[PDB]
Design a binder for this molecule. Structure first.
Ligand SMILES: *[C@@H]1O[C@H](CO)[C@@H](O[C@@H]2O[C@H](CO)[C@@H](O[C@@H]3O[C@H](CO[C@H]4O[C@H](CO)[C@@H](O)[C@H](O)[C@@H]4O)[C@@H](O)[C@H](O[C@H]4O[C@H](CO)[C@@H](O)[C@H](O)[C@@H]4O)[C@@H]3O)[C@H](O)[C@H]2NC(C)=O)[C@H](O)[C@H]1NC(C)=O
Ligand SMILES: *[C@@H]1O[C@H](CO[C@@H]2O[C@@H](C)[C@@H](O)[C@@H](O)[C@@H]2O)[C@@H](O[C@@H]2O[C@H](CO)[C@@H](O[C@@H]3O[C@H](CO)[C@@H](O)[C@H](O)[C@@H]3O)[C@H](O)[C@H]2NC(C)=O)[C@H](O)[C@H]1NC(C)=O
Ligand SMILES: *[C@@H]1O[C@H](CO)[C@@H](O[C@@H]2O[C@H](CO)[C@@H](O[C@@H]3O[C@H](CO)[C@@H](O)[C@H](O)[C@@H]3O)[C@H](O)[C@H]2NC(C)=O)[C@H](O)[C@H]1NC(C)=O
Ligand SMILES: *[C@@H]1O[C@H](CO)[C@@H](O[C@@H]2O[C@H](CO)[C@@H](O[C@@H]3O[C@H](CO)[C@@H](O)[C@H](O)[C@@H]3O)[C@H](O)[C@H]2NC(C)=O)[C@H](O)[C@H]1NC(C)=O
Ligand SMILES: *[C@@H]1O[C@H](CO)[C@@H](O[C@@H]2O[C@H](CO)[C@@H](O[C@@H]3O[C@H](CO)[C@@H](O)[C@H](O)[C@@H]3O)[C@H](O)[C@H]2NC(C)=O)[C@H](O)[C@H]1NC(C)=O
Ligand SMILES: *[C@@H]1O[C@H](CO)[C@@H](O[C@@H]2O[C@H](CO)[C@@H](O)[C@H](O)[C@H]2NC(C)=O)[C@H](O)[C@H]1NC(C)=O
Lengths: 108, 216, 174, 214, 174, 174
């Protein structure tokens, strides 16, 4: 009649890198790195964002007449531009200190 | 090459004692566990006993507790099993077998002996009696062998000149404590004219030869 | 370093053992084994849980980080901004990978140490009456049942109960 | 005590085929099962241990499978030497090591009718006081046959012994004998005796009959 | 990992021992013990002193760091400045806390290793004449006085002086 | 921690041994020794090679980094630029020095562990017939030739071949 002393084994296949060795098969492990995301743009804490659509920030503040849809908007969580936001300044010229205005605008 | 020879069988009176021995040759004997497994006639296998490699662990079957001991000798490379105070239902063929590994999960018994026979009963060595088995209107005839204790008998026909339709049934223990079998031959129905049959029965333990002709 | 137990003097693990990490395997008069050792495995679970929670709570979450804009006469500041972002990103990715690589040898050696200590304890409370035979097994010159099995497991063996009788059997084999 | 059980009891098969055998445990052994075959009047031999790994010096047509509580032996092809008896053994929780109950393996051929004969005793048995009457079946397939022993159209019990031969290499059919063994008194008492045979190959149960002193 | 001595096979520490970290406790014919082992404890003090001085001298002092000022049209640069300061502060606080947490297991295992080695040495130079009894104690089949006590302590035991006489007493108890 | 073998219970190294890191020294009937142990030293070489390659491949190369220019009214941005460069330089020099200092104790303890395990293996496969004598040497009560030397080296000793004969000689010395 005997006692033997041993340890647990399993059928897991997940591997762990280490310094002295690569691809070590471990019994239990835990991930620490997120990869998955939806393809959506939801609202921060129950307040909808503000989508400029085909309009620029300059076009929105000046009131570029083709940006007529977003005329009644007054609250948001964050502002969304697209890759087709081109309607900015219809009469040609130069909005002076446009970037400083975009930095002031990110706290309102 | 590994072989296991074994001896110590024979007919023994009820309440007696034996000492079977299994001699091993072909491996290091002091590094494998050993086991004894018996088989009743016309039944399945049954485990009897086990001794470990170092000889510090012995286990027995539950039905044979206290009546059986087991030991090993390294110098002779010999396994001994001592049987005490037997019963009628210990009549079996005994095998010595070897554990494949040395752990608890040993993984089957790879090498086996060849079987020694042990019969425990209370009877005398008695010669058999032969009776002819006669055709009324049929095409078969035979000889009936009755009331012999030890195994085996041998029944031949025409001193080996009859090897067609010869059926010799396996012996059966009758309730008195003896054995009885039969031997039959089918021939043509009309072969009762000139044809002569002689059944030749040989009983090697009691050494009795009986010659019997069968006819109506 | 490697303490020598896991894939060392002890061979591979036990699939048949379920409810723990470190356990026993016994073969007394009426059964086979696979019982776990709930004392040591609980200490291992506590240590590992505290380790993972510590590694989580050292890393602060980040708040909002949005890109900036520059015209064609502020190239210099724009390059400075890009340099700052890339520098901090390289520092954090280095810290993350290096922390995981060192922590893995630490945890594997921790398990190895636990197995070695669990073997040394059983050896130490079976000083004379055992005759160890290989890959962490013992063999009881005296006779043992379920009660002395649990007596070994808990850590209460009371050796002088058996010390004479074992001695007899030892002198039988010698 | 883990109790093993094999199924089915007897498997009949034609040559050039496979076969399957089931061993079932009352508890959960992990993978600690082995199988053995046994010829008549031989030692057993190790086939397959750990339910997956074949033994050294085993042809590759044998296969073993299963875990948990049910296990399966599978044979691909036969060459007429594999007709033997097969045993399963657990070694997960011993002592006591427990074996199965064996499953013999038979050759399957065409169903044939039994030839039924009878033999009244000889008079020197009554001179000794013995009555040995022999009811005989020769050359029949399959195994299962039924013998009914009647005295003046009344069934007997407890006074009959039977025996069965092996499976012959030529015709693969069987042979059965049954024997009435009594004293002088009954064989002098009644007159008309019979044995009636019921078999699968038989269209009708066949009766062989005789008289007292005939 | 854990070497198994401190709160392991040896029980709790000795309050009565003062002048060291690792020591002995002897009971010969005319006294009790508590003498320290000045050889090994000096190596421990040297190692720990070098460790603390290394950790101090890797951290450079900082010179003058005074805040800057910006008007209302330089918000962009001001946010960049704040980002740089907060980033470097997070990096240094991470490094400090992580360095202390790893260094603590290193030093506790260092002490544990020292106790185990100090036990193995005494066992190795008392091969036959000892009969160890539990939690790191030995028991001298032969007879010992203060001189053989110091002879054990220094590491100069000369076993063949006593090897026969012990043997006699051993065969008395067996 | 220190496993106790190198400059421990084993004294200084062997200059005469060339083709490895861990080896044996045997004195049978017809020779002296110095043969290496090619199994364990290969595992050590693999571990150390992977370690050095990992430390190399964690450090990314840098691309072009050229200084910038500022006039006398952009002192503020210039000081910010200098602060960024000096901060990142301090962080990287800290990481480099600290990584090397910890890796060195790791590798020395790794070698120490290998020597201790290589000793324990040889002890474990010579259970009764050895009589160890000091600083890792054994002494064979039975008689050994080159074949049992290689039999020890590979790890295939088959003890029950000699177990009786040794016993005789042991009882001769006792
Ligand atoms: C919101 O944003 C949209 C998209 O940017 C603006 O719509 C664009 O308006 C500009 C200016 O009117 C267009 O650019 C010019 O279009 C002229 C007409 O092109 C014809 O052929 C094209 C074929 O693809 C058609 O798409 C188009 O409908 C016309 O039929 C071009 O001729 C111009 O080319 C150049 O040559 C002429 C030569 O005289 C010069 O005058 C020009 O300066 C230039 O060098 C030029 O391409 C642009 O095509 C429009 N895009 C779309 C998608 O409609 C909206 O105007 C803007 N909102 C406001 C308030 O204006
Ligand atoms: C650690 O293991 C991973 C995964 O490989 C798995 O484990 C191995 C030990 C083997 O058992 C594999 O059969 C098993 O899947 C290795 O990752 C990748 O390995 C492959 C080679 O098997 C590398 O070659 C690539 O293969 C892919 C196709 O799968 C091609 O598209 C590539 O062009 C290239 O040929 C591959 O680079 C490597 N990485 C990835 C992400 O696939 C891994 O290499 C191994 N660790 C080591 C030692 O590097
Ligand atoms: C560790 O194991 C020991 C066993 O050595 C445990 O002590 C045991 O407690 C059990 C409780 O079931 C005792 O069994 C029963 O005790 C009752 C009450 O006396 C009795 O009526 C039953 O017939 C049976 O004996 C057992 O006897 C006792 N140990 C002894 C001396 O045999 C212990 O509780 C376990 N835990 C710890 C930390 O010790
Ligand atoms: C370690 O311990 C040994 C003791 O085994 C020390 O050696 C001893 O040195 C002392 C000095 O007091 C000796 O005691 C005295 O020696 C003088 C001079 O011979 C003698 O006149 C006194 O009567 C007394 O014996 C002691 O005898 C000697 N060891 C022996 C052989 O007994 C040693 O110095 C200590 N240090 C080291 C590193 O060894
Ligand atoms: C480890 O060492 C063992 C030695 O115990 C090696 O096995 C040995 O292989 C050598 C090959 O030279 C055998 O020597 C010779 O074998 C031939 C062929 O039988 C024979 O004709 C020669 O006279 C001589 O015996 C040696 O006998 C054999 N071991 C034994 C049983 O003595 C083994 O290969 C080495 N490697 C490993 C991993 O085992
Ligand atoms: C490894 O073993 C585990 C069981 O320990 C397997 O898990 C089983 O998976 C099947 C299919 O998902 C479930 O039906 C069972 O209930 C699971 N078992 C238990 C007890 O939970 C696992 O599938 C095995 N191997 C892998 C990785 O597939």
């Amino acid at each position: 009649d005997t006692i033997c002393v041993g340890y647990h084994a399993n059928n897991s296949t997940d591997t762990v890198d280490t310094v002295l060795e690569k691809n070590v098969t471990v019994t239990h492990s835990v991930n620490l790195l997120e990869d998955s995301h939806n393809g959506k743009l939801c609202s921060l804490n129950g307040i909808a964002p503000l989508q400029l659509g085909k309009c620029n920030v300059a076009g929105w503040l000046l009131g570029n007449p083709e940006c007529d849809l977003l005329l009644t908007a007054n609250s948001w969580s964050y502002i969304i531009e697209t890759s087709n936001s081109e309607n900015g300044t219809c009469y040609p010229g130069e909005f002076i200190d446009y970037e400083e205005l975009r930095e002031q605008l990110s706290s309102v | 090459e590994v072989q296991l020879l074994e001896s110590g069988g024979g007919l023994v009176q009820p309440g007696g004692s034996l000492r079977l021995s299994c001699a091993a040759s072909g491996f290091t004997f002091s590094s494998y566990g050993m086991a004894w497994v018996r088989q009743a006639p016309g039944k399945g296998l049954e485990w009897v006993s086990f001794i470990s490699a170092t000889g510090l662990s012995t286990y027995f079957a539950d039905s044979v507790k206290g009546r059986f001991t087991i030991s090993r000798d390294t110098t002779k490379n010999t396994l001994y099993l001592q049987m005490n105070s037997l019963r009628a239902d210990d009549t079996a063929v005994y095998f010595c077998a070897r554990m494949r590994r040395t752990m608890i999960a040993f993984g089957g018994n790879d090498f086996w002996g060849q079987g020694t026979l042990v019969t425990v009963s209370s009877a005398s060595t008695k010669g058999p009696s032969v009776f002819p088995l006669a055709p009324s209107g049929t095409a078969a005839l035979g000889c009936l062998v009755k009331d012999y204790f030890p195994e085996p008998v041998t029944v031949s026909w025409n001193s080996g000149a009859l090897t067609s339709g010869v059926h010799t049934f396996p012996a059966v223990l009758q309730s008195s404590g003896l054995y009885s079998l039969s031997s039959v031959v089918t021939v043509p129905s009309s072969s009762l004219g000139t044809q002569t049959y002689i059944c030749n029965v040989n009983h090697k333990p009691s050494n009795t030869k009986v010659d019997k002709r069968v006819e109506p | 370093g490697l303490f020598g137990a896991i894939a060392g003097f002890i061979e591979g693990g036990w699939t048949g053992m379920i409810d723990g990490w470190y356990g026993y395997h016994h073969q007394n008069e009426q059964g086979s084994g696979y019982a776990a050792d709930q004392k040591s495995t609980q200490n291992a679970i506590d240590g590992i849980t505290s380790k993972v929670n510590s590694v989580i709570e050292k890393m602060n979450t980040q708040f909002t980080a949005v890109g900036k804009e520059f015209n064609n006469l502020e190239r210099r500041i724009e390059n400075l901004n890009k340099k700052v972002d890339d520098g901090f990103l390289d520092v954090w990715t280095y810290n993350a990978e290096l922390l995981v690589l060192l922590e893995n040898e630490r945890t594997l050696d921790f398990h190895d140490s636990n197995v070695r200590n669990l073997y040394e304890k059983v050896k130490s409370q079976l000083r004379n009456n055992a005759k160890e035979i290989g890959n962490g097994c013992f063999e009881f010159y005296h006779k043992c049942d379920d009660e002395c099995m649990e007596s070994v497991k808990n850590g209460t063996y009371d050796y002088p109960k058996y010390s004479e009788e074992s001695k007899l059997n030892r002198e039988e084999i010698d | 005590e883990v109790v093993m059980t094999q199924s089915p009891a007897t498997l009949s098969v034609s040559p050039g085929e496979g076969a399957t055998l089931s061993c079932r445990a009352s508890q959960s052994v992990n993978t600690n099962v082995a199988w053995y075959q046994q010829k008549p009047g031989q030692a057993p031999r190790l086939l397959i241990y750990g339910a997956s790994t074949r033994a050294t010096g085993i042809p590759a047509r044998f296969s073993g499978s299963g875990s948990g509580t049910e296990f399966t032996l599978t044979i691909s092809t036969l060459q007429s030497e594999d007709f033997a008896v097969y045993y399963c053994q657990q070694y997960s929780n011993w002592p006591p090591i427990t074996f199965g109950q064996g499953t013999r393996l038979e050759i399957k051929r065409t169903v044939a009718a039994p030839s039924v004969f009878i033999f009244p005793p000889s008079d020197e048995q009554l001179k000794s006081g013995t009555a040995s009457v022999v009811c005989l079946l020769n050359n029949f397939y399959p195994r299962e046959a039924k013998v009914q022993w009647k005295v003046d159209n009344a069934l007997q019990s407890g006074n009959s012994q039977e025996s069965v031969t092996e499976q012959d290499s030529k015709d693969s059919t069987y042979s059965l004998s049954s024997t009435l063994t009594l004293s002088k008194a009954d064989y002098e008492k009644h007159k008309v005796y019979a044995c009636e045979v019921t078999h699968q190959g038989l269209s009708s149960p066949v009766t062989k009959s005789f008289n007292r002193g005939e």
